[PDB]
Amino acid sequence: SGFRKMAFPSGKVEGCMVQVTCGTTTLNGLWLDDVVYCPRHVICTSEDMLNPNYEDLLIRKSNHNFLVQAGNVQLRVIGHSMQNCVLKLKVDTANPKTPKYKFVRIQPGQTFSVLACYNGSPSGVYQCAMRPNFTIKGSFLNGSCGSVGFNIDYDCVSFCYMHHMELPTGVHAGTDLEGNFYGPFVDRQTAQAAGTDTTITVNVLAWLYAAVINGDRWFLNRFTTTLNDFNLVAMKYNYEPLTQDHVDILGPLSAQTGIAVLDMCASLKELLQNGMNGRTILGSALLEDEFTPFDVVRQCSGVTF
Amino acid sequence: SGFRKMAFPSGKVEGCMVQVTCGTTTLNGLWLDDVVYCPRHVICTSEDMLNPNYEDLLIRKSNHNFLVQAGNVQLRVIGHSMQNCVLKLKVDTANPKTPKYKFVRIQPGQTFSVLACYNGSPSGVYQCAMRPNFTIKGSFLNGSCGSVGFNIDYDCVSFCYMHHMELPTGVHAGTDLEGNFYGPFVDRQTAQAAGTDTTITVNVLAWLYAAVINGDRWFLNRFTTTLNDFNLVAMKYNYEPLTQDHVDILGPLSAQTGIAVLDMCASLKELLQNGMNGRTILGSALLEDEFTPFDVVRQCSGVTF
Ligand SMILES: *CC(=O)N(c1ccc(C(C)(C)C)cc1)[C@@H](C(=O)NC(C)(C)C)c1cccnc1
Ligand SMILES: *CC(=O)N(c1ccc(C(C)(C)C)cc1)[C@@H](C(=O)NC(C)(C)C)c1cccnc1
């Protein structure tokens, strides 16, 4: 029993973290096979910070301007290329610790683990969700860019996030491993505000199922509702709309707890309309929305990797 | 910026997790050098649970009854011994991945990272505190016994916890790596009282400093207090008494933020007496006590390993 915010074991990603230094700027890169991936703003100077011409800065750089360090092993860069907002440094050595991996682009609401890193070295691991407004509420200091987010399915690491920047509000913005920003953000020091984030409804419901599984059941009521009536309530409380897909996704938890999804929707509706009355659910006084249905199952079922 | 419950990178521990099988029951072991550490109750069976005679049960076993698997590779057990509540299987082979390590017995209120494992395979990593009553509020299912908790200091893994059991109460009990239980618990299937818990005051204050460092400052008050006055309040709200030692441990945070320790206590006193009025501190509606002052500094300074 018990329910905690659990990250994937980070070993397979730790062996891929390197340090990338171009001129005065050092950040983290991802070493897979003979390629190092890192944010393109490594080639920026403090001058270009407000609006850099990335094509200009790049074409002028050559292979030896990039210092890549895997632990104490210096890698020799034998090629470089820019793909969207990431740099791909070709190195002379394939990473002997390269795991089975894929690059994926996650949807809002999906969770992943972040291995926060500085100067190529791992600092700690925690779980994040891609917020509906395409930011993440992470823990990133200066030099953390290039840290990555990932999921692990048995032996295969699915890289989904590379960290690039903090917004003025303290939230975090980044790309997939093809360099495409999540959300409308760009890699310059400009005026870019996240936008109103909403609550991931299907996740709150999964966590409510998790609560029931662990014996917290006070919030359960004698009411049901409809998807339409519930969506009216979710919209008033800045909750993502619930779809038939979300309902289908919640089947497994519904069949384990014997609690119909619409019945749990009626519970969540009462919790949104009346608040929590100073009670706690799974040790929290807020409705928690950073567990997917897969997370709840995996944590209540023991899936390993 | 930002602040999350952050675990140490788990890689060094991942290469140490093996599967130990003795007859019917299989659990997780810790393979360091040529020794595999696991809960001695792996030698129990169905009828032995309520009050096993471990000395007697161990006698009925010899080396070949203990199946150790490190991945698909089989380890040959060549010696076996009981140390308090842990079995020590001496094996044919030193773990080539053995990190630099120590065994330590931590103090209540200290934190560590847990690498939750099933069948010798890691499934996730999370941070938690040794409660004042020597339990931990973890996430552990059947077969998770043998999973370990640890801290890392640069390159040395300090193993401090091995998981043994869930109390019917839902919290978790285990031992140091010499097999001595934290708290009054015994490794038998019997009802066992954990005893009154307390909130870890110094950690709450450390987390309030973390909050200030991250821009949540609404709770900072126009008031002060005294150690004895604060402790009268702390004891009413089931908080650990604050000592000068705790004050001194808070010195660096107080120095960084410019807020005297006894002033932050005045802030904490009023949160305790009045609640949060539906405000959140670092995304929480409860006062968090699972961050040590060192945890905060490490996270807000980007310490690396
Ligand atoms: C990479 C990094 O850590 N940055 C960062 C530097 C430079 C940029 C641009 C503007 C694209 C050149 C973006 C990010 C840190 C930083 O220096 N500044 C801001 C606040 C992100 C603009 C940083 C600090 C904290 C968290 N993430 C990133
Ligand atoms: C090892 C394990 O996962 N146990 C467990 C088995 C056997 C024992 C004793 C009674 C000491 C032989 C202790 C723990 C799980 C379990 O089956 N039962 C209890 C309730 C913990 C006693 C278990 C399940 C969940 C979390 N931890 C352990």
Short mmCIF file of C-alpha atoms in Angstrom, two decimals, chain A:
data_model
loop_
_atom_site.label_atom_id
_atom_site.label_comp_id
_atom_site.label_asym_id
_atom_site.label_seq_id
_atom_site.Cartn_x
_atom_site.Cartn_y
_atom_site.Cartn_z
CA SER A 1 0.00 0.00 0.00
CA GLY A 2 0.85 3.70 -0.07
CA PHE A 3 0.88 6.23 -2.90
CA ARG A 4 3.75 8.58 -3.69
CA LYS A 5 4.98 10.73 -6.55
CA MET A 6 7.37 8.18 -8.04
CA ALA A 7 9.95 8.79 -10.74
CA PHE A 8 11.46 6.16 -12.98
CA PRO A 9 14.89 4.82 -11.98
CA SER A 10 17.31 7.21 -13.61
CA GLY A 11 20.31 4.94 -14.22
CA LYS A 12 19.72 4.42 -17.94
CA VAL A 13 19.57 8.21 -18.49
CA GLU A 14 22.50 9.01 -16.14
CA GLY A 15 24.86 7.11 -18.42
CA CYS A 16 23.81 9.40 -21.30
CA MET A 17 24.39 12.77 -19.61
CA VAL A 18 27.37 14.78 -20.83
CA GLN A 19 28.60 18.33 -20.55
CA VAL A 20 28.63 20.61 -23.59
CA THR A 21 30.67 23.80 -23.57
CA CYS A 22 30.71 26.27 -26.45
CA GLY A 23 32.75 29.36 -25.73
CA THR A 24 31.71 30.70 -22.33
CA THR A 25 28.47 28.69 -22.00
CA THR A 26 28.20 25.23 -20.42
CA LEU A 27 25.06 23.09 -20.22
CA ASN A 28 23.93 19.44 -20.38
CA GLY A 29 23.68 17.21 -23.44
CA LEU A 30 22.20 13.79 -24.17
CA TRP A 31 24.72 11.28 -25.59
CA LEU A 32 22.97 8.52 -27.58
CA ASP A 33 24.97 6.39 -30.01
CA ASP A 34 27.48 8.77 -31.69
CA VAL A 35 25.33 11.91 -31.28
CA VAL A 36 25.08 14.48 -28.48
CA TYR A 37 21.79 16.41 -28.27
CA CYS A 38 21.61 19.73 -26.46
CA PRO A 39 19.71 23.05 -26.58
CA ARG A 40 20.84 25.26 -29.44
CA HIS A 41 21.20 28.30 -27.18
CA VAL A 42 24.53 26.83 -26.04
CA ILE A 43 25.93 28.78 -29.03
CA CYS A 44 24.47 32.04 -27.74
CA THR A 45 26.46 34.77 -26.08
CA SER A 46 25.11 37.16 -23.48
CA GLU A 47 24.79 39.71 -26.30
CA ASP A 48 22.33 37.70 -28.42
CA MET A 49 20.12 36.79 -25.43
CA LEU A 50 17.19 39.05 -26.31
CA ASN A 51 16.85 37.99 -29.97
CA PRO A 52 19.58 35.72 -31.35
CA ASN A 53 20.18 34.87 -35.01
CA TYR A 54 20.77 31.16 -34.56
CA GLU A 55 21.58 30.39 -38.20
CA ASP A 56 24.24 33.11 -38.10
CA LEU A 57 25.93 31.98 -34.88
CA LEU A 58 25.94 28.35 -36.02
CA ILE A 59 27.31 28.34 -39.60
CA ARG A 60 30.34 30.21 -38.19
CA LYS A 61 31.03 27.65 -35.45
CA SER A 62 33.17 24.63 -36.26
CA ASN A 63 33.55 21.20 -34.68
CA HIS A 64 36.40 22.20 -32.33
CA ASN A 65 34.39 25.13 -30.86
CA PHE A 66 32.23 22.51 -29.09
CA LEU A 67 33.72 20.85 -26.02
CA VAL A 68 31.87 17.67 -25.03
CA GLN A 69 32.81 15.89 -21.81
CA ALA A 70 31.36 12.53 -20.75
CA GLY A 71 32.57 12.35 -17.18
CA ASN A 72 36.33 12.78 -17.62
CA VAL A 73 36.24 11.35 -21.16
CA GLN A 74 36.54 14.12 -23.71
CA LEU A 75 34.57 13.34 -26.86
CA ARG A 76 35.78 14.62 -30.20
CA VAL A 77 33.09 16.37 -32.23
CA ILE A 78 33.27 15.34 -35.90
CA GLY A 79 30.12 17.11 -37.10
CA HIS A 80 27.44 19.52 -36.00
CA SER A 81 23.93 20.35 -37.15
CA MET A 82 20.94 22.30 -35.82
CA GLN A 83 17.45 20.78 -35.83
CA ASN A 84 14.79 23.25 -34.70
CA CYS A 85 15.95 24.32 -31.23
CA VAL A 86 18.40 21.45 -30.58
CA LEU A 87 22.01 20.98 -31.62
CA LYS A 88 23.20 17.56 -32.76
CA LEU A 89 26.95 17.18 -32.27
CA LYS A 90 28.36 14.16 -34.05
CA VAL A 91 31.08 12.60 -31.94
CA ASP A 92 33.78 10.06 -32.81
CA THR A 93 32.58 7.58 -30.15
CA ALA A 94 29.24 5.80 -29.76
CA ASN A 95 28.04 5.88 -26.15
CA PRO A 96 28.66 2.35 -24.81
CA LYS A 97 25.85 2.91 -22.29
CA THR A 98 23.25 3.90 -24.89
CA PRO A 99 19.98 2.25 -23.81
CA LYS A 100 17.21 1.11 -26.06
CA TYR A 101 15.51 4.43 -26.70
CA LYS A 102 12.87 6.29 -28.66
CA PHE A 103 12.07 9.97 -29.06
CA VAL A 104 8.41 10.75 -28.43
CA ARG A 105 6.34 13.92 -28.19
CA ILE A 106 3.97 13.71 -25.23
CA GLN A 107 0.49 15.26 -25.04
CA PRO A 108 -0.56 17.65 -22.26
CA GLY A 109 -1.39 15.75 -19.10
CA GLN A 110 1.17 13.00 -19.67
CA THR A 111 3.75 12.56 -16.92
CA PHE A 112 7.46 11.89 -17.10
CA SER A 113 10.53 11.83 -14.90
CA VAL A 114 13.12 14.63 -15.04
CA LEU A 115 16.76 13.95 -14.25
CA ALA A 116 17.94 17.40 -13.25
CA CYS A 117 21.59 17.89 -14.16
CA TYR A 118 24.38 20.50 -13.92
CA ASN A 119 27.71 20.45 -15.80
CA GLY A 120 26.83 17.01 -17.15
CA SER A 121 26.29 15.44 -13.73
CA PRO A 122 23.00 14.16 -12.26
CA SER A 123 21.57 16.10 -9.34
CA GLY A 124 18.21 14.45 -8.64
CA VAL A 125 15.10 12.91 -10.13
CA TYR A 126 11.46 13.94 -9.86
CA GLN A 127 8.11 13.45 -11.60
CA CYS A 128 6.48 16.16 -13.79
CA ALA A 129 3.35 16.50 -15.88
CA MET A 130 3.14 18.39 -19.16
CA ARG A 131 0.63 21.03 -18.08
CA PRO A 132 -2.31 21.86 -20.38
CA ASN A 133 -0.63 25.21 -21.12
CA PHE A 134 2.52 23.34 -22.23
CA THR A 135 4.80 24.28 -19.38
CA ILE A 136 6.07 22.11 -16.55
CA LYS A 137 6.37 22.94 -12.85
CA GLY A 138 9.91 21.67 -12.39
CA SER A 139 12.93 22.41 -10.23
CA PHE A 140 15.61 23.89 -12.47
CA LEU A 141 18.46 26.26 -11.66
CA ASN A 142 20.81 28.09 -13.97
CA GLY A 143 22.77 25.52 -15.98
CA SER A 144 20.00 22.91 -15.79
CA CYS A 145 19.12 23.32 -19.48
CA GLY A 146 19.72 20.17 -21.48
CA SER A 147 18.32 18.04 -18.67
CA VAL A 148 15.74 15.65 -20.09
CA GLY A 149 12.43 14.06 -19.22
CA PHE A 150 11.61 10.47 -20.00
CA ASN A 151 9.49 7.42 -19.44
CA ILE A 152 10.73 3.85 -19.18
CA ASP A 153 8.86 0.84 -20.58
CA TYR A 154 10.80 -2.24 -19.44
CA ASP A 155 14.22 -1.64 -21.02
CA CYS A 156 13.38 1.21 -23.40
CA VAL A 157 13.77 4.89 -22.47
CA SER A 158 11.24 7.18 -24.18
CA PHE A 159 12.78 10.64 -24.14
CA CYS A 160 10.05 13.24 -24.33
CA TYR A 161 11.44 16.51 -22.90
CA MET A 162 14.62 18.59 -23.01
CA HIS A 163 14.81 21.57 -20.64
CA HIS A 164 15.50 25.02 -22.16
CA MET A 165 14.30 27.85 -19.95
CA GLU A 166 12.42 29.33 -17.03
CA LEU A 167 9.64 31.77 -17.72
CA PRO A 168 9.19 34.93 -15.61
CA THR A 169 6.48 33.09 -13.61
CA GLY A 170 8.88 30.39 -12.42
CA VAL A 171 7.52 27.66 -14.68
CA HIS A 172 9.60 25.82 -17.23
CA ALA A 173 9.58 25.40 -20.97
CA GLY A 174 11.33 23.03 -23.28
CA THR A 175 11.35 20.94 -26.42
CA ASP A 176 10.98 17.40 -27.57
CA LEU A 177 14.17 15.67 -28.65
CA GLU A 178 13.61 16.93 -32.20
CA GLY A 179 13.92 20.48 -30.86
CA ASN A 180 10.28 21.49 -31.21
CA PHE A 181 9.04 23.52 -28.27
CA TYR A 182 6.09 22.32 -26.29
CA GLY A 183 3.76 25.28 -26.38
CA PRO A 184 4.30 28.48 -28.33
CA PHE A 185 7.54 29.35 -26.64
CA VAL A 186 10.80 30.33 -28.31
CA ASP A 187 14.39 30.22 -27.07
CA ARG A 188 15.10 33.92 -26.59
CA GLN A 189 14.86 36.31 -23.64
CA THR A 190 11.57 37.84 -24.69
CA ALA A 191 8.06 38.50 -23.40
CA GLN A 192 6.45 35.05 -23.39
CA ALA A 193 3.81 34.21 -20.80
CA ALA A 194 2.51 30.67 -20.34
CA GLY A 195 -1.20 31.28 -20.37
CA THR A 196 -3.92 30.11 -18.03
CA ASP A 197 -3.23 26.53 -17.00
CA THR A 198 -6.14 24.18 -16.26
CA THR A 199 -6.46 20.99 -14.20
CA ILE A 200 -5.99 17.60 -15.91
CA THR A 201 -9.37 16.06 -15.08
CA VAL A 202 -8.66 12.48 -16.13
CA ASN A 203 -5.61 12.57 -13.80
CA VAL A 204 -7.52 13.84 -10.75
CA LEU A 205 -9.98 10.98 -11.33
CA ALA A 206 -7.18 8.42 -11.57
CA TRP A 207 -5.80 9.74 -8.28
CA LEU A 208 -9.25 9.49 -6.69
CA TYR A 209 -9.25 5.83 -7.78
CA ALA A 210 -5.78 5.53 -6.23
CA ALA A 211 -7.20 6.95 -3.00
CA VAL A 212 -10.02 4.40 -2.96
CA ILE A 213 -7.53 1.60 -3.61
CA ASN A 214 -5.52 2.71 -0.56
CA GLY A 215 -8.60 2.92 1.67
CA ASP A 216 -9.36 6.63 1.54
CA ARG A 217 -13.05 6.60 0.62
CA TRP A 218 -14.90 9.39 2.44
CA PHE A 219 -15.33 11.51 -0.65
CA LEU A 220 -17.51 8.83 -2.25
CA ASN A 221 -21.18 9.79 -2.52
CA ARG A 222 -24.59 8.33 -3.36
CA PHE A 223 -24.80 10.38 -6.58
CA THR A 224 -24.02 9.80 -10.19
CA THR A 225 -23.91 12.27 -13.06
CA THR A 226 -23.58 12.45 -16.83
CA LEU A 227 -20.52 13.31 -18.87
CA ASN A 228 -22.28 16.47 -20.07
CA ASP A 229 -23.42 17.58 -16.62
CA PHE A 230 -19.97 16.84 -15.19
CA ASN A 231 -18.28 18.76 -18.02
CA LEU A 232 -20.39 21.80 -17.16
CA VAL A 233 -18.91 21.59 -13.66
CA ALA A 234 -15.35 20.95 -14.85
CA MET A 235 -15.53 23.99 -17.10
CA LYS A 236 -16.62 26.25 -14.23
CA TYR A 237 -13.63 25.12 -12.14
CA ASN A 238 -11.01 25.38 -14.94
CA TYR A 239 -10.79 21.62 -15.45
CA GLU A 240 -9.98 19.97 -18.76
CA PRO A 241 -13.06 18.53 -20.48
CA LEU A 242 -13.58 14.81 -19.92
CA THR A 243 -13.92 12.74 -23.08
CA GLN A 244 -15.16 9.25 -23.84
CA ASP A 245 -11.50 8.44 -24.44
CA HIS A 246 -10.75 9.51 -20.87
CA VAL A 247 -13.65 7.36 -19.68
CA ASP A 248 -12.33 4.35 -21.61
CA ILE A 249 -8.83 4.99 -20.20
CA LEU A 250 -10.32 4.85 -16.69
CA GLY A 251 -11.99 1.47 -17.26
CA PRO A 252 -9.20 -0.58 -15.64
CA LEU A 253 -9.41 1.41 -12.40
CA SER A 254 -13.20 1.34 -12.54
CA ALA A 255 -13.22 -2.45 -12.83
CA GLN A 256 -10.73 -2.90 -9.98
CA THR A 257 -12.57 -0.62 -7.53
CA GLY A 258 -16.05 -1.50 -8.75
CA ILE A 259 -16.73 2.24 -9.00
CA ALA A 260 -18.24 3.49 -12.26
CA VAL A 261 -16.41 6.43 -13.81
CA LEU A 262 -19.53 8.61 -13.82
CA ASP A 263 -19.98 7.86 -10.10
CA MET A 264 -16.43 9.04 -9.45
CA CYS A 265 -17.23 12.07 -11.62
CA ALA A 266 -20.13 12.78 -9.24
CA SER A 267 -17.71 12.56 -6.30
CA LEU A 268 -15.28 14.95 -7.96
CA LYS A 269 -18.17 17.31 -8.75
CA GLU A 270 -19.08 17.44 -5.03
CA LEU A 271 -15.43 17.94 -4.13
CA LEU A 272 -15.16 20.80 -6.61
CA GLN A 273 -18.42 22.42 -5.50
CA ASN A 274 -17.95 22.08 -1.73
CA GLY A 275 -14.19 21.85 -1.31
CA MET A 276 -12.41 19.41 0.97
CA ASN A 277 -13.67 20.67 4.36
CA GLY A 278 -10.18 20.47 5.84
CA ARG A 279 -9.95 16.76 5.02
CA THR A 280 -7.06 15.09 3.22
CA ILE A 281 -6.92 12.53 0.41
CA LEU A 282 -3.79 10.38 0.18
CA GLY A 283 -2.02 12.89 2.41
CA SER A 284 -2.89 15.99 0.38
CA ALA A 285 -5.32 18.84 1.01
CA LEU A 286 -5.56 19.62 -2.73
CA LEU A 287 -6.92 17.64 -5.66
CA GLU A 288 -3.78 16.19 -7.27
CA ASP A 289 -3.60 15.99 -11.06
CA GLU A 290 -0.08 14.79 -11.93
CA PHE A 291 -0.83 11.05 -11.89
CA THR A 292 -2.06 9.51 -15.13
CA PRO A 293 -4.26 6.41 -15.08
CA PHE A 294 -1.17 4.49 -16.15
CA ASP A 295 0.77 5.97 -13.23
CA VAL A 296 -1.94 4.92 -10.76
CA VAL A 297 -2.07 1.39 -12.19
CA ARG A 298 1.72 1.05 -12.35
CA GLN A 299 2.05 2.22 -8.75
CA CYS A 300 -0.83 0.07 -7.47
CA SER A 301 0.30 -2.93 -9.58
CA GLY A 302 4.12 -2.90 -9.26
CA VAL A 303 5.24 -2.73 -12.90
CA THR A 304 9.05 -2.81 -13.03
CA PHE A 305 11.66 -1.95 -15.67
#
